[PDB]
Design a protein around this ligand. Structure first.
Ligand code: ZN
Ligand code: ZN
Length: 52
DNA sequence: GCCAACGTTGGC
DNA sequence: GCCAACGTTGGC
């Protein structure tokens, strides 16, 4: 839907820890104000263009 | 009950 | 139209 499930981004299991979306996550110390997937896990086909 | 990450929205 | 922010809820 937002995932094709077979590109590199869809197959990734590990958040990069360094992009703006990761730095937002509570797991990396952020405020959880943004709340999107890691930039490297944004489906290359289906994701909003601005999320890649 | 919590939570990942989606779709919606307000302010620009 | 963009995008920061956050209500939402399927899945756990
Ligand atoms: Zn990342
Ligand atoms: Zn994909």
């Amino acid at each position: 839907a937002r995932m094709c499930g077979e590109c590199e981004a869809c197959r990734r299991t590990e958040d990069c820890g360094h992009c703006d979306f990761c730095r937002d996550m509570k797991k990396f110390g952020g405020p959880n104000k943004i709340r999107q997937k890691c930039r490297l896990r944004q489906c290359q086909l289906r994701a909003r263009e601005s999320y890649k």
